[PDB]
Amino acid sequence: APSYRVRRADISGHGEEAVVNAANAKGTVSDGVCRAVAKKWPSSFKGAATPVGTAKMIRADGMTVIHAVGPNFSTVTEAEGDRELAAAYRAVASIISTNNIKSVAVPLLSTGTFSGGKDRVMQSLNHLFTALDATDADVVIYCRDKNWEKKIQEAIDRR
Numbered sequence: 001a002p003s004y005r006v007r008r009a010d011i012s013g014h015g016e017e018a019v020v021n022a023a024n025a026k027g028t029v030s031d032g033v034c035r036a037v038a039k040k041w042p043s044s045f046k047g048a049a050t051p052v053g054t055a056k057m058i059r060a061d062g063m064t065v066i067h068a069v070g071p072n073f074s075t076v077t078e079a080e081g082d083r084e085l086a087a088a089y090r091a092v093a094s095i096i097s098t099n100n101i102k103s104v105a106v107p108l109l110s111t112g113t114f115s116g117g118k119d120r121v122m123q124s125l126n127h128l129f130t131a132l133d134a135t136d137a138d139v140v141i142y143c144r145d146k147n148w149e150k151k152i153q154e155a156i157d158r159r
């Protein structure tokens with residue numbers, strides 16, 4: 001069975017075997033998780049472009065980087081975004097299980113730039129749990145907000 005922890009820290013400082021980038025479909029560097037990932041593992045972005053609702057893995061700079069593209073909720077209906085966000089997390093879970101990845105640092109996809117101006121912490125976290133429950137990985141969820149850290153910890157505990 002998988003294990004879940006939350007850290008309020010820069011995800012670039014994670015101690016896990018792999019890291020999930022909250023990526024865009026074009027594989028460009030922009031504000032958010034992506035900027036921290038690009039600074040720490042700059043060569044991890046070579047050929048990383050992948051469609052919304054999918055994930056693409058690379059080994060670069062001594063790290064396993066999983067580029068997961070959540071939906072931009074400004075560009076899809078709520079129901080379409082919900083399906084695509086579930087799909088991105090399942091694509092992450094598949095990469096974890098098929099590559100025997102023991103531990104992974106994961107941000108909450110579609111909760112920043114792609115949030116469409118809405119609070120989607122619980123929506124994104126619930127899809128993270130559902131998808132990564134299919135793995136036996138040690139999952140560490142990364143955030144920067146003290147409020148988010150507490151709600152994520154509350155959610156982990158309820159399980």
Ligand SMILES: Nc1ncnc2c1ncn2[C@@H]1O[C@H](COP(=O)(O)OP(=O)(O)OC[C@H]2O[C@@H](O)[C@H](O)[C@@H]2O)[C@@H](O)[C@H]1O
Nearest residue numbers: 010011022023024030031032033036109110111112113114
């Ligand atoms: N370095 C970081 N470490 C940990 N958490 C972080 C970090 N940077 C941002 N976060 C948090 O991770 C969550 C996801 O943030 P985004 O990176 O904005 O993710 P998303 O909404 O999926 O959009 C990602 C996209 O932003 C675009 O600029 C860019 O193209 C990138 O692909 C947000 O709650 C944010 O507070």
